[PDB]
Amino acid sequence: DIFNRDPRDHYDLLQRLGGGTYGEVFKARDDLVALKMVKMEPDDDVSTLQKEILILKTCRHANIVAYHGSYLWLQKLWICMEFCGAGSLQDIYQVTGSLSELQISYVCREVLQGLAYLHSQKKIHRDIKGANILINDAGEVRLADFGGTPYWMAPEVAAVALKGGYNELCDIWSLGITAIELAELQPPLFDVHPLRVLFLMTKSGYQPPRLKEKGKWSAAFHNFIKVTLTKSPKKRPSATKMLSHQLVSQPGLNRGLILDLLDKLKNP
Ligand SMILES: Fc1cc(NC2=NCC3(CCOCC3)CO2)cc(F)c1Oc1ccnc2[nH]cc(C3(C(F)(F)F)CC3)c12
């Protein structure tokens, strides 16, 4: 059901939230939602999204931003989703400064619960980072679902153009980098040219990154980083396995840690 009704018949529009990497997004009410709007242009064909649309509606979990349905009404696709009033962790840390280890430990647990669920549906997130971890005003954590010609490509080039070949354990690596990003306000190598990073990561002598200040963080955090950032995908622990890790299975982790962060945000 890709409705054609006009969003403005089910929802009142409240404030525009987008810009930057997020594009055009609206706060709205029925229950508060986000409406992301994409301008459909000439050769555009909604039916080519068919595949990546069913992947959304049937992916239902507390730690995954809920997808409520789409609209084409008038040259524009509108995706209606669970509203997260505080935006991304990147929106937040750009104001509050670095998260505490306990805040990061709660975020990691909630993300790993979401990743365990996506991996169970044979979905790979592919884009874990501060910008794609959303926070609601209750301090709860939700993973955001964003996203030349092929006419001459061999079918094996086409397969890679889509998939990659790699598997869901790439999300575990991205979570490690995100944990460092939440601690230090940038991923490792952020000041290094992207091409150079690709080449360096590609060497067999590449050292996985680390937390810069050793003394600031518990051995459990250093160990969480060391194991999430396992070079070999074959020895890298799963989401489910990572959720028994000391850092994320410690008691005291709850949304209070984030309500704190949100107080600090509006009272900086
Ligand atoms: F998470 C969002 C963050 C931002 N932040 C931002 N920082 C700098 C800016 C440039 C400088 O000016 C000020 C803002 C541009 O924007 C903007 C957004 F619109 C965001 O989207 C949502 C917001 C709230 N509930 C949602 N639920 C789902 C979603 C998304 C969907 F919008 F894509 F649907 C993401 C999945 C969603």
Author numbering: 7 to 36, 41 to 157, 174 to 294
Manuscript excerpt for this entry:
Mitogen-activated protein kinase kinase kinase kinase 1 (MAP4K1) is a serine/threonine kinase that acts as an immune checkpoint downstream of T-cell receptor stimulation. MAP4K1 activity is enhanced by prostaglandin E2 (PGE2) and transforming growth factor beta (TGFβ), immune modulators commonly present in the tumor microenvironment. Therefore, its pharmacological inhibition is an attractive immuno-oncology concept for inducing therapeutic T-cell responses in cancer patients. Through its proline-rich domain, MAP4K1 binds to a diversity of adaptors in hematopoietic cells, including those involved in T-cell receptor (TCR), B-cell receptor, and cytokine-induced signaling. The function of MAP4K1 has been studied most extensively in the context of T-cell activation.
Through iterative structure–activity relationship (SAR) studies, optimization efforts led to the discovery of compound 38 (BAY-405), which is a highly potent and selective inhibitor of MAP4K1. BAY-405 displayed potent activity toward MAP4K1 in biochemical and cellular assays, with a ROCK2 selectivity ratio of 130 in the biochemical assay and an overall selectivity score of S = 0.080 (80%, 1 μM)27 against an external kinase panel consisting of 373 kinases, representing a significant improvement over compound 1 (BAY-755; S = 0.13). BAY-405 was confirmed as an ATP competitive active site inhibitor, as demonstrated by the fact that both kinase inhibitor (IC50 = 11 nM) and ATP binding competition assays (IC50 = 6.2 nM) rendered highly comparable IC50 values, and further supported by a prominent shift in IC50 value in a high ATP kinase activity assay (IC50 = 56 nM at 1 mM ATP). With respect to cellular activity, BAY-405 inhibited phosphorylation of SLP76 with submicromolar activity (IC50 = 0.63 μM). The X-ray structure of BAY-405 in complex with the kinase domain of human MAP4K1 shows an ATP-competitive binding mode, with the pyrrolopyridine anchoring the molecule to the hinge region via two classical hydrogen bonds. The trifluoromethyl-cyclopropyl moiety sits smoothly in the back pocket of the kinase, which remains in a DFG-in conformation. The central fluorinated phenyl ring (A-ring) is arranged perpendicular to the hinge binding heterocycle, with the conformation being stabilized by the o,o-disubstitution. The tip of the nucleotide binding loop folds back into the pocket, allowing for a π–π-stacking interaction of the A-ring with the side chain of Tyr28. While the oxazine moiety engages in a bidentate H-bond with the Asp101 carboxylic acid, the terminal tetrahydropyran ring in the spiro-ring system does not show any direct interactions with the crystallized kinase domain. BAY-405 enhances T-cell immunity and overcomes the suppressive effect of PGE2 and TGFβ.
